[PDB]
Amino acid sequence: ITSTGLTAKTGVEHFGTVGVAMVTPFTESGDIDIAAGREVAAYLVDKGLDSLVLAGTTGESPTTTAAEKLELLKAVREEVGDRAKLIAGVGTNNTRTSVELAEAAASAGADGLLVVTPYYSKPSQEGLLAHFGAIAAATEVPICLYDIPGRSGIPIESDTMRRLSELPTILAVKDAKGDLVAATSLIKETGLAWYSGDDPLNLVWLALGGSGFISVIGHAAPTALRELYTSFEEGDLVRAREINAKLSPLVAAQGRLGGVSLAKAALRLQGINVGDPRLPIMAPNEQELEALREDMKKAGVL
Amino acid sequence: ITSTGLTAKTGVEHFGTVGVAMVTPFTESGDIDIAAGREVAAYLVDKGLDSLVLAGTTGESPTTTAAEKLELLKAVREEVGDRAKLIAGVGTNNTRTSVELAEAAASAGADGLLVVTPYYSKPSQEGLLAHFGAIAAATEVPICLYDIPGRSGIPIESDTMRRLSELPTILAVKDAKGDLVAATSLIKETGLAWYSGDDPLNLVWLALGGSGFISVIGHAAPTALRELYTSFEEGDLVRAREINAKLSPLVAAQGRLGGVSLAKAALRLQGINVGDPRLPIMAPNEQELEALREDMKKAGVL
Amino acid sequence: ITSTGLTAKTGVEHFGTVGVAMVTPFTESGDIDIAAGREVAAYLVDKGLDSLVLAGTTGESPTTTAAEKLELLKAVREEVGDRAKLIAGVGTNNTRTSVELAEAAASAGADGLLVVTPYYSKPSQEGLLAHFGAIAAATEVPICLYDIPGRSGIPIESDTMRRLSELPTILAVKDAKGDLVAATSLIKETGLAWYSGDDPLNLVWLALGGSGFISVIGHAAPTALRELYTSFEEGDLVRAREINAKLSPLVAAQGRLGGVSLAKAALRLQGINVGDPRLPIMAPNEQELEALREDMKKAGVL
Amino acid sequence: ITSTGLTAKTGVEHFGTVGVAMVTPFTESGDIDIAAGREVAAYLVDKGLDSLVLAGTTGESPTTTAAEKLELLKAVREEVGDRAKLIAGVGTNNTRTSVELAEAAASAGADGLLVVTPYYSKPSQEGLLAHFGAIAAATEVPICLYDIPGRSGIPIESDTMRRLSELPTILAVKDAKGDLVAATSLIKETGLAWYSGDDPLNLVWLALGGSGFISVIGHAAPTALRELYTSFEEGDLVRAREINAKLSPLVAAQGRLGGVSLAKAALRLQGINVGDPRLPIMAPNEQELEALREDMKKAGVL
């Protein structure tokens, strides 16, 4: 019994197909709100998401402590562990702490690990092989590399990606680089599952052989994103591009506000208060919230 | 009687679906070779192309005279006019000469006009509206805007594109900019037919609602490109991405050699001598030709 | 008898020290205005400029014919030939026409030749050596390479620059690339005279060993530019940076309007009407002219 | 009694004139080596440096603990506190920890604070005002903003810089952005002391009104850097550009190796072992060390 759709199925047994880098809810005073975290996770999954990245960029990994992370992880697992892949962001720009975070996540029962390219310090590609190498050797949990030079300062070059694909636990890439020329070949060569790490390219990556997405706007239009995926899967391409174009306003808003502020502001607008972000990240002001409502109504999610 | 496929059909009655910016063959001494031009055009069309851009970038518009252009145009029209859309490159960075070239092409019976964004001088967007405006008013021939900041120095901004889509003869865009965020919305808003102006994004543009391509590597793999299109059209997406990935080496070669040198060198390697380019453009040296043969054999076209 | 100042004197006997890429005056109907051209040249030189580039970017080389160029050149030579170096822009993206333009300029008595990197077509560096090579072999007139990837699409790489510095007539570079790392070494290695091709870096280039400038804003503040040079030359650095900062508003305006529109609009505002530019280039509208007056008054030149 | 040189003296009473972002020495096993830290600081200052940034990028702030930082700071202060300005890097991409680090540094007796633009998360400019605002309100220690979009992902926009210059403790900018157009005006407007944060622009910034540098290559050529400064100060510009060009190879090496690896590898080569960097940063391999020796000998420092 097997029914092959049009979408590559590579690594979906570890990272799912349609998911989001979930926000980390905070109370009015900036404290982590575990209850709202479990609420949001169940909400999103019930909406169609089958994967959740906890402690990712959108999850505000820079302003949360290691304990807060582990806490959210264990809490969400108890909530939606039986029906969604839970991916833990454990990469930092310090190999030692990256290792610590990965071991803690493994013991917590994480289905996968998101390891961003070390940011700010700009290590050499040789440094990347040593960094990722150490992390992959610390646990048996599947790893999804996170390529995003726009935030980290350096990219994971093609040759480097090919070497890393040789490690037994490195099985996927969240791609926020958008180098379609290089990726088109790597997807075929490395055997790595490629996930869209940039909402405007969700449909684009599926067409090139992607396995799914790890979205931001998915917080505001989870059902739509699932539909984008299924549409492509079933060959209803016209439907896919209509949905993709439909959600454009959310992309524009993300561009003006940033993933964190947008995700938290959009959920609140839909009646799900998950607090505000921690400094230096900020919630949208009155004028920005007005522009956001506009985009959300145009996107058909408000 | 109508059978809707998955590909947008916008403007294909003027610019076709699968075509290439055809090379302008030169004899050993640098003179235009009309006979080889007609030979190549018939060859490409018989291979599956239903559109040809004459005097485009790949056609070496910078080193050919206005007379040589008109000549190739009239010659190709006599050869494949009854079965392919002929698009004439007429844009320059001088509004007066751009107008002159467009009128000459109209009288020659061109099915469409390719008008690149003025290069080098970097006019303002207001200047673009006046430039394109004058050209569109000079003839009744459908116009395809050519957006490629990488060669011209400036892009056709979104607002500017929306204004231009109001002119009755402006019906399409060759996109070599790759701003998927902006284009996803423009395609739906302006009603303009969008054509892939960058081979690695051919499949990507179809997924976003594109109408076809105006390729470079199409010179070396015309049948494959047609298949890429038909595959998408029929819903065979797996086939589409396999073909796309298959042709990657050609893209790499274009990246190392440039469209002109690659197109002319590749045809020669397949037994179709169309000469060398005119300075400052140069044919690949011995070492480069070796790397090219490699890519062509990997791409399955040699 | 010799009094060494702080400024490098390399190649100033061919290209001068303080000059501008002069505009090409047009009458109300777009025709070349030779009289105003001679008027402006005498005006600028009397103001302190000792060099003039005719038919450069700012001189609207894309919209003027070869005859109009030769005409302006011969006219200005008759006007200020006995007291200013006249540099002729002869580079195009066609090696044949570039050669034609250089020979015509040589016969006209040009003191130097400005040869921009071929634009739009993006030739390989090998193509550049062949292109510049052919031009340098056609006449005995000193050549100043014009490096500006921002307009042409490609840069003159360092290794390429080193090879070209070996040709006996290649003696200078107008630098509009701003790669201070590479240039700092090339200036010392190649022995080429380096000229600032970007007003905000005029003072910066002198500090790194430059020989002078080929300005745009110099049209509006010729005396000031001369003073910037002399100040540095005499060691009055405080004065130099005060003048440099003082002229900043002009740079901002050039950034909003482009060199051509700015140069022609600024002269008109100072009582010297040199017409408007030719399409696609456009004069500033009413609102832009207001902002320009503001910048000019702040710069102290209105 | 006052003798004005050519260099701006703004804020040098808090941040000095010639200094480096000092490395954080580690023993063979990766542990902090306080003794070598004090040795290097005394060495550099005796060589001519009058300022030292501790826990900066080059000081490997990403892989060292808060305690290790405070420790190095207190240790260096005891060593060279009576003759050099000690600047503490305290900025992170978490406002709370940035505040914690700044208070700890204040109590330690820091002469100034270096606060980098929050990296990776890409906050809005409004977020920057709130971030820097909170930090500046926590202590009375002079603050030097660190603008470097190349590492952080976002820049400190001009308007944002103008607002921040209003806070009483914000008195300087380490500039690693290189936007000479914007800075030329900000230096005059904001009254902020500008420091070169990129070695190839050290001389460039002095010419534009800079107050000094916070170098990387200064580890390998401290006396030369001091001479670069004094030369400019005394009006010996020819000497200044000869020194600047002379040190170019070090810049090239920094470009290939990165500041940390270069600084530590270069010191070792000069007989001062400060260990290797912590992962993901890596020391140069055998081949790289050979190329480095070459550059150092050419730079005249080996």
- The answer to whether B86 touches B106, Cβ cutoff 8 Å, is no
Interface of D with A in 160-179 (CB under 8 A): none
- CA–CA gap between residue A154 and residue A29 (Å, rounded): 35
Interface contact A204, partner B, CB < 8 A: yes
- CA–CA gap between residue C248 and residue D185 (Å, rounded): 7
Is the omega angle on the peptide bond into residue D280 within 30 degrees of 0, that is, cis?
yes
- The answer to whether A196 touches A213, Cβ cutoff 8 Å, is yes
Identify the helix (H) or strand (E) that includes residue A48: none
Residues facing residue C52 across a β-bridge:
C20, C86
Residue A119 designated active-site? no
CA quadruple B282, B285, B288, B289: dihedral, nearest 10: 100
Inter-chain CB proximity B181 and A237 less than 8 Å: no
Q: Is there a binding annotation on residue B243?
A: no
Structure tokens at C158: 């360092």
Which positions in chain B touch C282 (Cβ < 8 Å)? 123-124, 126-127, 130
Residues facing residue C174 across a β-bridge:
C146, C195
Task: Please enumerate in sequence order all residues whose Cβ is within 8 A of that of C14, keeping only pairs 6 or more positions apart, or say none.
Answer: C85, C111, C112, C142, C171, C172
Task: Give, as one character, the DSSP assignment of residue A82.
Answer: T
Interface contact C118, partner B, CB < 8 A: yes
Residue C56, amino acid: G
Is the omega angle on the peptide bond into residue B149 within 30 degrees of 0, that is, cis?
no
Return the closest-CA partner of residue D62 out of D40, D91, D86, D34: D91
Residue B271, amino acid: G
Interface contact B272, partner A, CB < 8 A: no
| Residue carrying the six token digits 């380019």 | B277
* Cα B247–Cα B249–Cα B251 angle in degrees, nearest 5: 80
Q: Which residue ranges form the domains of chain B, and what is each CATH number?
A: 1-302 (3.20.20.70)
Resolution in A: 2.2
Chain centre to alpha carbon of residue C277: 17
Structure tokens at B16: 């076709």
Query: How near does any CA of chain D get to the CA of C13, in Å?
Result: 20
Q: Which residues of D are catalytic?
A: 146, 174
Which positions in chain C touch B127 (Cβ < 8 Å)? 279-282
Inter-chain CB proximity A134 and D279 less than 8 Å: yes
- The answer to whether C251 touches C221, Cβ cutoff 8 Å, is no
Task: Give, as one character, the DSSP assignment of residue A189.
Answer: H
3 state SS for chain B: CCCCCCCCCCCHHHHCCEEEECCCCECCCCCECHHHHHHHHHHHHHCCCCEEEECCCCCCCCCCCHHHHHHHHHHHHHHHCCCCEEEEECCCCCHHHHHHHHHHHHHCCCCEEEEECCCCCCCCHHHHHHHHHHHHHHCCCCEEEEECHHHHCCCCCHHHHHHHCCCCCEEEEEECCCCHHHHHHHHHHHCCEEEECCHHHHHHHHHCCCCEEEECHHHCCHHHHHHHHHHHHCCCHHHHHHHHHHCHHHHHHHHHHCHHHHHHHHHHHCCCCCCCCCCCCCCCCHHHHHHHHHHHHHCCCC
- CA–CA gap between residue C195 and residue C176 (Å, rounded): 9
- The answer to whether B56 touches B24, Cβ cutoff 8 Å, is no
- The answer to whether C117 touches C155, Cβ cutoff 8 Å, is yes
Q: Which chains touch D (3 or more CB pairs under 8 A)?
A: A, C
Task: Please enumerate in sequence order all residues whose Cβ is within 8 A of that of A8, keeping only pairs 6 or more positions apart, or say none.
Answer: A187, A193, A209, A210, A211
Which positions in chain A touch D122 (Cβ < 8 Å)? 151, 258
Structure tokens at C143: 């050549």
- The answer to whether C283 touches C277, Cβ cutoff 8 Å, is yes
Q: Which chains touch B (3 or more CB pairs under 8 A)?
A: A, C
Catalytic residue, chosen from A69, A74, A119, A146, is A146
Catalytic residue, chosen from C146, C177, C229, C264, is C146
Inter-chain CB proximity D245 and C180 less than 8 Å: no
Q: Rounded to 5 degrees, what are φ and ψ at C128? A: -65, -40
- The answer to whether C130 touches B279, Cβ cutoff 8 Å, is yes
Query: How near does any CA of chain D get to the CA of A277, in Å?
Result: 11
- Ramachandran class of D235: left when φ > 0, alpha when ψ lies in -120 to 50, beta otherwise: left
Interface contact A35, partner B, CB < 8 A: no
- CA–CA gap between residue D35 and residue A94 (Å, rounded): 24
Structure tokens at D138: 């926590």
- CA distances B270 to A33, A100, B37, B72, Å, are 66, 57, 16, 22
Task: Give, as one character, the DSSP assignment of residue A278.
Answer: P
Q: Using a CB cutoff of 8 Å and minimum separation of 24, what contacts does D135-138 make?
A: D135/D90, D135/D91, D135/D95, D135/D98, D135/D99, D135/D102, D136/D167, D136/D168, D136/D169, D136/D170, D138/D99, D138/D102, D138/D103, D138/D106
Catalytic residue, chosen from C74, C174, C177, C264, is C174
| Residue carrying the six token digits 């702490």 | A97
Structure tokens at B190: 């302006």
Q: Give the DSSP letter string of chain D.
A: -----SS--TTHHHH-SEEEE----B-TTS-B-HHHHHHHHHHHHHTT--EEEESSTTTTTTTS-HHHHHHHHHHHHHHHTTTSEEEEE---SSHHHHHHHHHHHHHTT-SEEEEEPPPSS---HHHHHHHHHHHHHH--S-EEEEE-HHHHSS---HHHHHHHTTSTTEEEEEE-S--HHHHHHHHHHH-PEEEE-SGGGHHHHHHTT--EEEESGGGT-HHHHHHHHHHHHTT-HHHHHHHHHHTHHHHHHHHHH-HHHHHHHHHHHTT-----PPTTS----HHHHHHHHHHHHHTT--
- The answer to whether A282 touches A61, Cβ cutoff 8 Å, is no
HSE-up (13 A, CA, CB side) for residue C70: 12
Q: How many CB atoms lie within 10 A of CB B116?
A: 26
Nearest to A185 among B180, B208, B245 (CB): B245
Chains A and D touch (3+ CB pairs under 8 A): yes
Q: How many CB atoms lie within 10 A of CB A119?
A: 26
- Reduced to 3 states (helix: H, G, I; strand: E, B; else coil), residue A247 is coil
- CA–CA gap between residue A57 and residue C163 (Å, rounded): 48
Nearest to B184 among A185, A206, A244 (CB): A244
Which positions in chain A touch B232 (Cβ < 8 Å)? 237
Catalytic residue, chosen from B85, B174, B177, B264, is B174
Inter-chain CB proximity C204 and D209 less than 8 Å: no
3 state SS for chain C: CCCCCCCCCCCHHHHCCEEEECCCCECCCCCECHHHHHHHHHHHHHCCCCEEEECCCCCCCCCCCHHHHHHHHHHHHHHHCCCCEEEEECCCCCHHHHHHHHHHHHHCCCCEEEEECCCCCCCCHHHHHHHHHHHHHHCCCCEEEEECHHHHCCCCCHHHHHHHCCCCCEEEEEECCCCHHHHHHHHHHHCCEEEECCHHHHHHHHHCCCCEEEECHHHCCHHHHHHHHHHHHHCCHHHHHHHHHHCHHHHHHHHHHCHHHHHHHHHHHCCCCCCCCCCCCCCCCHHHHHHHHHHHHHCCCC
End-to-end CA gap in chain B: 41
- CA–CA gap between residue C92 and residue A254 (Å, rounded): 43
- CA–CA gap between residue B199 and residue B68 (Å, rounded): 27
- CA distances C37 to A239, C74, C255, C272, Å, are 62, 11, 25, 11
Which positions in chain C touch B279 (Cβ < 8 Å)? 94-96, 123, 127, 130-131, 134
Return the closest-CA partner of residue B141 out of B104, B192, B187, B174: B104
Which positions in chain C touch B95 (Cβ < 8 Å)? 63, 278-280
Task: Give, as one character, the DSSP assignment of residue A26.
Answer: B
Q: How many CB atoms lie within 10 A of CB B65?
A: 12
Q: How many CB atoms lie within 10 A of CB D189?
A: 13
- CA–CA gap between residue A255 and residue C285 (Å, rounded): 31
